[PDB]
From a paper:
Adeno-associated virus (AAV) is a small ssDNA satellite virus of high interest (in recombinant form) as a safe and effective gene therapy vector. AAV’s human cell entry receptor (AAVR) contains polycystic kidney disease (PKD) domains bound by AAV. Seeking understanding of the spectrum of interactions, goat AAVGo.1 is investigated, because its host is the species most distant from human with reciprocal cross-species cell susceptibility.
The AAVGo.1 cryo-EM structure of a complex with a PKD12 fragment of AAVR at 2.4 Å resolution shows PKD1 bound with minimal change in virus structure. Just PKD1 was observed in the AAVGo.1 complex, with the two-domain PKD12 cryo-EM reconstruction and receptor density for the PKD1 subunit strongest at the viral interface. There are only minor conformational adaptations in AAVR, but there is a near-rigid rotation of PKD1 with maximal displacement of the receptor domain by ~1 Å compared to PKD1 bound to AAV5. The AAV5 VR-VII residue Gln532 makes contact with PKD1 (Ile349), and the Ile349 interaction is absent in AAVGo.1. The lysine can be modeled within the density for Arg353 in the map of the AAVGo.1-PKD12 receptor complex, suggesting that goat AAVR might be only minimally different and that Lys353 might have interactions similar to what we observe with human PKD1 Arg353 in the AAVGo.1 binding pocket. At first approximation, the binding of AAVGo.1 to AAVR is similar to that of AAV5, so the one exception becomes a second structural class in terms of the mode of binding.
Author numbering:
A (entry chain A), B (entry chain A), C (entry chain A): 209 to 726
The structure:
């Protein structure tokens, strides 16, 4: 529209209206000119002695907007209002708007770097509505809209891995190259803006409640069962039985079973670090799955287990989501102690989910005879069974919202391991790049020009999300557990900027506070 | 309405009308004043050396109506008419009515206990329509409407277990107390009655047929497959093949597989008791699952297996439903032989379901080389796989009808292990209690009165259920197996009262008699 | 209506609908025949050496329904939902219903006490709509509807004090006798019920929030004031000034002042009991007001002060509401330690209200000269001043809801000291009594009969209250403090019945959790 007219306003807000809540976030972004306007074939061989690290892909000159983290939409107080009062929620719609674009020309001379705006430069933007591009958004990576509204952020560079040959850095006949310029995109000069809208598919509500009953103790503790159980064999081999008494939950017949489990090693946090094995390199003794001839770690394991047992300091670390308390630099290889990190605990699900670091149980391992005694053996892993129930991983304020279900034609219970909503058609990738501007070209050449004017753009982005809420409807008499701002002798305010302006966050806030009977 | 006017009639009947059958049952109940009108915190530590027996809960002064057993609705003859003629059935609706209430005042003086009616006393009744209370009805417990119509029964006392801490008798911050008086209930004096109606959710038909074909022998025995199989390696290592011939079912390619299995120990009934290991305590060598740090027995195991192999006397007792031939007293710890009990056999499902006490099969356990021979190892347990089929547990005349699916947000194939229909919203809990009547209180006190007049109530209850039937539609030429009243030299009539008036039942009647090809 | 027909149902519930919440409570009561149907002149002289204890009054044969406590209407969980999510609330309407009346005849013979119902006996009920009777309901006395729904309670006996002469037990010419039979009342036999409705007058919302700013630090800490202050006098007597700098809150000019205060003694709870004066009898050294020649203690003092200073263990006990953790017997004179009681803390109001046990400040006490130095003196009490602000006492789950404003024709800020809503026309007194039934009178006499049949009645009472809520509307970013069910190593569930059936309550729950800037 115009150089001296704003193409949009600043909208950050939450509006609660019954069973709906609309969140609005606006952030300032900055887009670098990645790769110098070129596509590059990126590849890697075996790194750290693991050929599962090998890949073949492409880095593109495009950047992308990632809105896949709860804190990009929810302030800590609104999150508290959500988890203390509702049984569940789910995304309904999304509206994105990119505006107030500013393209800057950078010029370095002799020890001098000036910056001036280029009023005629454009920025290109498109959304991948048909999912024709490798969707890299739901894999727990950096670059999402920052939690704290005033924080300015750089858009991450779009890249992808395709097929590599024999766990090496070579491509195969099936490796695919995708050209992002081969999509129709809108071009924006300083007065133009871009708007996009999207609606989520019917997805089940995330469960924001913990069970107030144990799965194996659902029977009335005052009445016996009209069922009998084999208890022994007489001195002559006659089978003997007894009635299952009231309250003896170790013996009652069960109708339902706990979800699938796969044993993972348990480690003690600090209080119990003296009981941990010393100097052990976890990779060699970790849970791994094989695929195409290589072994990959599979944290945080499939859903169905609890990583800790409420009241203990032992964690099944590979079944745990681990966040940094602060934003880290790219490529850091420092070894962090637990004092800098935020460990998540899924102990609220222990009345239903089995403990990840213990054996799942025991089964018969032979045929009993008058000469051979009955034998049992414990099992470390057990997959899904008919009539089994479990609770999915909880969502966190600083964790992912959705994940795209891989299109293969066959899947089971499409719920991403890192938590969130599994979607067949998630919010489309929104790509953006600075349109190239050639330097001073005087003569002709059939070779593509390589000399460009260095630029970078900036602007604002606003994301509006409507969420549907599930009202709590309990008849519990006594008070419930609530997430509360409880600190003893605070030296600073959590979820607030400190003296240096840095946003501080000392806790990973889950969703499970309210209870429900089974 | 009035003291001298009946508030309802006696309806016991079955009406067959095409693909529908309506059952009506009326019984006389008696409600004691449980706990003396108080709520009590009930708890237990480790019992019988098992901390899975520990619990923390509440016993309430309420009683409840349980209609969750087939014989509370079906006479033995109607059950026979059902299982000999239909392929399946399922619940459609339910109507309950409580009437002809009589409250009796009990007064004991010096070695004298008189009983008079209290015309002004009430009884309180409510149904938990929103499932806000711990549903204790579908866990195979006593207290259901008796099988024989003239039998008067006592309503069981409502109680529940909530969360306990570290497998002990202490509560946790999440333990929930539910006050039943915090629900709106109808109050009834002698002339009043209470009626309730409910409709079942679309649930799949229970299958009342046995397969007349084996899962691995579905191929035409007269034609070969156009498929070849690896049979060996030559003296030089060349792989060799052969065509899969007609009728050689051990070698045909299969399209479908048997359901999941988990080996359980097998024991011989009497005929073969001399081949059983002697003096063995089953608990230590039983199939158990771990949950929250404790091990629980999980009878009757998940669906997918047959507990016996038709033609043998060996049973996988932990995969078996065991009923008493008669009603037992509360808390009995006698050790019963198999002569007093009714063992159920699921052998009709053996053409499809794997045998619970045998190994499930064998798989490769290494990589074959010119130096290492191919090795295989048997597996005792195997969970669900794509393209697998199995048959659910059969229902019995003396067994449960439904079970409530635990609300967790994630489950697989919600079919209760004890058989029946898995429901998200089952018939609501119907609670009832005698309204308290204070004794002679003369002075004031801020402390709740503890002195009450002792009462108990009685009345009639009628339950009407509509069932939907699936007609048999077979082209089998020869006669089918039918359940029949066949006894040799009967000393009494089964399913009839004996000389002392006691109702006798010598057999557990299943549902699988008709056959169907796969 | 009828002997065998219930005249009402049981309604206990809470229904939240936007800015309104309707609470319903039903309880069972028992009414003794107080005084044996007679009015008695009750009086007392000086008790415990205090003639403020003298009184002259009347005890009547009537009982009354008291609904003036929050826990008679709010379950602990609904209270938590209220205080964690709203900024305020206020009563809108009330509906009361008394039904299912049962009159019992008591007859004691030789060491035998039988109880039978008297179907023709009545109970009398009336409400004092015009406030013509001494309103004894809002003075923190026992007898209200019990907190726990299943608890049966005795109605307290209605009595009142009128004028006594010279602090003695004699009446004056102005002492008034009120005959309750001189009001029209409804008579109820077993089939009848009584209903009453009432609407509250526009009353201001109770404030359920704590200030997140201090009253004396409202100025921007980054900007100075354009005001100067007198700081000293030169060596020649010239007055000198300085500008009030940014953030120096000790010197900024203020626009508002803290509410009124009246120093009360401070005492240390247990942690600091070694610093308390030993063996001191509080009455002689307590805060007292004189009236009609006698001195009365005036706990909990007028509004405007905080009784504790967050972070300390010292309490201004006379400015504190003290509840028992359990119901106590009538007339107990035991000396309780703080381990049995629930002390309330108003520290949330300290940013605005002055500390009750410290001096209020200091003022000039002379006229400065070249010979006399300026002198200041501290003041222990200070009443209301123009431009002063304070916060009223908080309400508790176990405290009073309203108080009747004394009709005198002149009052200031009608807010009861014990907290709650001050009303000119509060819910009317609801009186009830057992109609007298003469014994066997054979001959005539002009003297009123004294021989009566001993009876007592019982029934149910339901109270429905509509409350209006004030939605929280904050822009605070970081999480707020919330009331939470947090206990470490619980041996029992708080706000739940224990093993003996007794309802336990270990905490007084206030209303101030959310914050607001000033």
């Amino acid at each position: 529209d115009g150089v001296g007219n704003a193409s949009g306003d600043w909208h950050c807000d939450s509006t609660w209206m019954g069973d709906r809540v609309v969140t609005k976030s606006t952030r300032t972004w900055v887009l670098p000119s990645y790769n110098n306007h070129q596509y590059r074939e990126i590849k890697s061989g075996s790194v750290d002695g693991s050929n599962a690290n090998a890949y073949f892909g492409y880095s593109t000159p495009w950047g992308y907007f990632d809105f896949n983290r709860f804190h990009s939409h929810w302030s800590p107080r609104d999150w508290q209002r959500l988890i203390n009062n509702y049984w569940g929620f789910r995304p309904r719609s999304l509206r994105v708007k990119i505006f107030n674009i500013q393209v800057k020309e950078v010029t370095v001379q002799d020890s001098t770097t000036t910056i001036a705006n280029n009023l005629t430069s454009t920025v290109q933007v498109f959304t991948d509505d048909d999912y024709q591009l490798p969707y890299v958004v739901g894999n727990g990576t950096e670059g999402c809209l920052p939690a704290f509204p005033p924080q300015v952020f750089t858009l991450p560079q779009y890249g992808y891995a395709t097929l590599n040959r024999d766990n090496g850095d070579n491509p195969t006949e099936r490796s695919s190259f995708f050209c992002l310029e081969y999509f129709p995109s809108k071009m924006l000069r300083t007065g133009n803006n871009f708007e996009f809208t999207y609606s989520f598919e019917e997805v089940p509500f995330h469960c924001s409640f913990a069970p107030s009953q144990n799965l194996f103790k659902l029977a009335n503790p005052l009445v016996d069962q009209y069922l009998y159980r084999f208890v022994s064999t007489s001195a002559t081999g006659a089978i003997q039985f007894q009635k299952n008494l009231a309250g003896r939950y170790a013996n009652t017949y069960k109708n339902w079973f706990p979800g699938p489990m796969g044993r993972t090693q348990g480690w003690n946090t600090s209080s119990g670090s003296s009981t941990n094995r010393v100097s052990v390199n976890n990779f060699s003794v970790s849970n791994r799955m094989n695929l195409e001839g290589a072994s990959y770690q599979v944290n945080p394991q499939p859903n169905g287990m609890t990583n800790t047992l409420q009241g203990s300091n032992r964690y099944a670390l590979e079944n745990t989501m681990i966040f940094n308390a602060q934003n880290a630099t790219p490529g850091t290889t420092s070894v962090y102690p637990e004092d800098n990190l935020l460990l998540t605990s899924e102990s609220e699900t222990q009345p239903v989910n089995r403990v990840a670091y213990n054996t799942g149980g025991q089964m018969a391992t032979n045929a009993q005879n008058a000469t051979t005694a009955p034998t049992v053996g414990t099992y470390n892993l057990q997959e899904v069974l008919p009539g089994s129930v479990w609770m999915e991983r909880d969502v966190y304020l600083q964790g992912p919202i959705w994940a795209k279900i891989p299109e293969t034609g066959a899947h089971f219970h499409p719920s991403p391991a890192m938590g969130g909503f599994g979607l067949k058609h998630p919010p489309p990738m929104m790509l953006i790049k600075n349109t190239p501007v050639p330097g001073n070209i005087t003569s002709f050449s059939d070779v593509p020009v390589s000399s460009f004017i260095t630029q970078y753009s900036t602007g604002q982005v606003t994301v509006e999300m409507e969420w549907e809420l599930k009202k709590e409807n309990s008849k519990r008499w006594n008070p419930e557990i609530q997430y509360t701002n409880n600190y003893n002798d605070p030296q600073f305010v959590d979820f607030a900027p400190d003296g240096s302006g840095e946003y501080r966050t000392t806790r990973a806030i889950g969703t499970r506070y309210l209870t429900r009977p089974l």
